[PDB]
Amino acid sequence: IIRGNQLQEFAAMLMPHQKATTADGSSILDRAVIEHNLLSASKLYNNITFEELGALLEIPAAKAEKIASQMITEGRMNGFIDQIDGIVHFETREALPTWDKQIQSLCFQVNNLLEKISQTAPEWTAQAMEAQMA
């Protein structure tokens, strides 16, 4: 997530035609970074309210919703908006598929740990495998 304080050194090197305001008080630079921030924020959240969404993107409550609905309907992000309670649901996992994913990760950690065991002390690993019969 790119905050608005690390882009001051970037807007100075932009070409003069790229710094054109769109008649709403916001330049071109702080519109693409807003959409990028919103798309990146959907990878860290399962759902977020409008007030909190408008706390890390500025644009408090009325423009964050408009931009969020604008990114959707164009195949740019996955989600849906519940305007009654003011919350945006991005991606919900279905429990059982998550269980199999975590099982795969658990087995991956088992294999990786044994790989380091056989890589650090190969002489001990061979003795342990033979002793596994007894």
């Binding site: 059982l96 598929p97 199999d100 099982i103 795969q104 658990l106 087995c107 294999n111």
Partner: protein, 306 residues
């Protein structure tokens, strides 16, 4: 494990999995002398392709790239099933839509079979296969003609069509086994439109067998012990969700078969109720197998450390 698993594996003796690998010469002679496929015509319905044969056929089909390739397949028959135990390539040269096997394939066939008989290959040629690079798995007009020619004189014969392009682009093998009807015989009677769309013009001239694969015990052990991604994918296979749609389709055509059996039993001679019951038992058994896998996974992973 003691007595329980000592005789459960018994590597000294071939298991029930390796039973199919044994060639019974007397049974083969008896079944070919009886000729039970002459009376009926939808006799053979299942085609059991071995793992090595499928792998060799797939690799040969992909090796040609966009050009067609062809070869023969050895095997035998058992009841209503055609078993393919091996396959072997032919030294032919073909284009993207035509393979002929003019003069080098016909010597290679006989010479290769003679060489194979020397090192203990008791199976005889059971079929021919060719690849369709990028236009599905079906039988063309000349394919149907040569299938009729092969079937009319060499009675047991099944044509296998592979599709390397769709196999690579989809991640799963695209294969199809087919058999044909005699010349000018059996003209039996939204379906026709899609049928001609995905098959050729001769949709009613040939039928498609149900293709299944098998493997031996040593093959199973070597495969499951090859990479670590095969026992990890077993402890997290998650059935009943990978192929739920297939289960719903099986329930649907089960319902249709049950309706047909109810219609038949109220009043050619096939006993449709028994087949419907067998299909129902089969699909329920897959469902229960999936549930057992889920229960085993839950007991193994969730019930540890409080």
């Amino acid at each position: 494990a003691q007595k329980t698993w000592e005789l459960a594996n018994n590597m000294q003796e071939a298991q029930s999995i390796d039973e199919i690998y044994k060639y019974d010469k007397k049974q083969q002679q008896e079944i070919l002398a009886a000729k039970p496929w002459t009376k009926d015509h939808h006799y053979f319905k299942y085609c059991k392709i071995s793992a090595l044969a499928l792998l060799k056929m797939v690799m040969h089909a992909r090796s040609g790239g966009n050009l067609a390739v062809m070869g023969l397949m050895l095997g035998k028959v058992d009841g209503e099933t055609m078993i393919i135990m091996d396959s072997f390539a032919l030294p032919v040269e073909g284009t993207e839509t035509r393979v002929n096997a003019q003069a080098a394939a016909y010597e290679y066939m006989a010479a290769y079979i003679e060489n194979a008989k020397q090192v203990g290959r008791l199976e005889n040629a059971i079929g021919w296969y060719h690849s369709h690079p990028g236009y599905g798995c079906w039988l063309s007009g000349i394919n149907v003609s040569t299938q009729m020619l092969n079937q009319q004189f060499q009675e047991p014969f099944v044509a296998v069509v592979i599709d390397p392009t769709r196999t690579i682009s989809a991640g799963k093998v695209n294969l199809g086994a087919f058999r044909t009807y005699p010349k000018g015989y059996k003209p039996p009677d939204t379906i026709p439109l899609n049928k001609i769309e995905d098959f050729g013009v001769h949709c009613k001239q040939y039928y498609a067998l149900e293709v299944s694969y098998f493997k031996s015990s040593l093959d199973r052990k070597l495969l499951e012990l090859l990479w670590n991604k095969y026992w990890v994918n077993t402890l997290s296979s998650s059935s009943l969700l990978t192929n739920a749609d297939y289960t719903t389709g099986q329930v649907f055509d089960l319902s249709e078969k049950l309706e047909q059996s109810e219609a038949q039993l109220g009043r050619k001679s096939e006993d449709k109720l028994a087949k419907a019951t067998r299909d129902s038992c089969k699909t329920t058994i897959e469902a229960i197998h999936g549930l057992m896998s889920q229960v085993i996974k839950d007991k193994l992973f969730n019930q540890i450390n409080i």
